């Protein structure tokens, strides 16, 4: 049967390099165009690069052009992707894919490998920047308002958020962080409180980022 087996992924820092390989078997490798397609965590498929059966024609997606180089060795039945100047946004599973035959209309990818994981991440610690999300009643139930704290651009996980030093727990929703294309994390913590309390009760979010030994207490006031 047709088999495509990728290797060469790993964990690298921004600016680093990796060479991916795809070992093909079970078909005449030199008779088919070959492709790389990648998938960022939780995202969809993105075509990366293609190479024709005897390397006559090579194409790249704009997102990788000038940094990635595709090649093949038909004697070794191998496809390669040399990845230079890697960025955090290049993090993805990279799939080797064969282009099928078609009489026209641009062809399909008829066989896919198992993928190799590429993770591009700086290990440098980054403390968070914390901003208040001033109360708004627009999206809440009657007589209540939502306020919160935005915890921006930290690394690595995790951070903890409490409200009023742990005295306020009811109606708190701290959202899971987003891993941004910069390689840093951001999250938000929102709490719904009575509108009548906004002029009287103080609301403070307590943010602790132990990896950076950073602690921030942010008062969230009506605007």
């Amino acid at each position: 049967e047709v088999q495509l087996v990728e290797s060469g992924g790993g964990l690298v820092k921004p600016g680093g390099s990796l060479r991916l390989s795809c070992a093909a078997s079970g078909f005449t490798f030199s008779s088919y165009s070959m492709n790389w397609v990648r998938q960022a965590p939780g995202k969809g498929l993105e075509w990366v690069s293609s190479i024709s059966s005897s390397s006559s024609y090579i194409y790249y997606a704009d997102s990788v052009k000038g940094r990635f180089t595709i090649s093949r060795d038909n004697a070794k039945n191998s496809l390669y992707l040399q990845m230079n100047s890697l960025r955090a946004e290049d993090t993805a599973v990279y799939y080797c894919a064969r282009l099928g035959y078609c009489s026209g209309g641009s062809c399909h990818f008829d066989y896919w490998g198992q993928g190799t994981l590429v993770t591009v991440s700086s290990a440098s610690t980054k403390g968070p920047s914390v901003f208040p999300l001033a109360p708004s009643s627009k999206s809440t139930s009657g007589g209540t308002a939502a306020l919160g704290c935005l915890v921006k651009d930290y690394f690595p996980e995790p951070v903890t958020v409490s409200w009023n030093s742990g005295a306020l727990t009811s109606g708190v929703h701290t959202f899971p962080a987003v891993l941004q294309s910069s390689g840093l994390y951001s999250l938000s913590s929102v709490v719904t409180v009575p509108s009548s309390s906004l002029g009287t009760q103080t609301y403070i979010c307590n943010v602790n980022h132990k990896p950076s030994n950073t602690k921030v207490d942010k008062k969230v006031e009506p605007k």
């Binding site: 969809g44 075509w47 293609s50 997606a61 078609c102 641009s106 990818f109 008829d110 708004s136 939502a146």
Partner: protein, 213 residues
């Protein structure tokens, strides 16, 4: 650009469901066929439909595809748990000297609980952040099922895809799903537009919240 697919398509066992794939005159409408891939959880994509409507060997005839104009469609009859997967349409686009273009993907779910529509809270940039020469809009999405949404940002009425960071959905403690999306702007951009919007699409729901300086 990409092909637009619904984030979530769902039904009861045995139901027939359909997945739309919306392109433009630069891809599906430019003479190019549409192909479909099935990605079971944790697996590589596998060819499901090629050349608009052809089934490879091993793909049940419960799956069928069609193309019409600038759109395509995948139909699944007799839905069962083994069909739960992400489905991607794919074509070719003639812009930017040519590229293979994928759909945004559709999660197919056999309903284990009734559908729940998302709630959306949108925060504007804080005055504090603007003083730090930055601007982030915060779109918080909660209490939806199945666990797949599309988030789209707009400046005034025009789509904005630069500077967007959106999470994959998380499962809340109440077993519905949540997600968040962040739009990064310069303070000048925030001040110069009439408004910005966060639009959340989920099954038969579209919710659009809008904030202004």
């Amino acid at each position: 650009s990409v092909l637009t697919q619904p984030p979530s398509v769902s039904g009861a066992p045995g139901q027939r469901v359909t997945i739309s794939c919306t392109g433009s005159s630069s891809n599906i409408g430019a003479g190019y066929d549409v192909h479909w891939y099935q990605q079971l959880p944790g697996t590589a994509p596998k060819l499901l439909i090629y050349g608009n409507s052809n089934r490879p060997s091993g793909v049940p005839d419960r799956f069928s595809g069609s193309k019409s104009g600038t759109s395509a469609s995948l139909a699944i009859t007799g839905l069962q748990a083994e069909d739960e997967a992400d489905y991607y349409c794919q074509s070719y686009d003639s812009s930017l000297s040519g590229f293979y273009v994928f759909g945004t993907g559709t999660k197919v779910t056999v309903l284990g609980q009734p559908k729940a529509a998302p709630s959306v809270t949108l925060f504007p940039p804080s005055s504090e952040e603007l003083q730090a020469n930055k601007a982030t809009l915060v779109c918080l999405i909660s209490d939806f099922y199945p666990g797949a949404v599309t988030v789209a940002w707009k400046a005034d009425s025009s789509p904005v895809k630069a500077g967007v960071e959106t999470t994959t959905p998380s499962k809340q403690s109440n077993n519905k799903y949540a997600a968040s999306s962040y739009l990064s702007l310069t303070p000048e951009q925030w001040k110069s537009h009439r408004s910005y919007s966060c639009q959340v699409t989920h099954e038969g729901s579209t919710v659009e919240k809008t904030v202004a300086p």
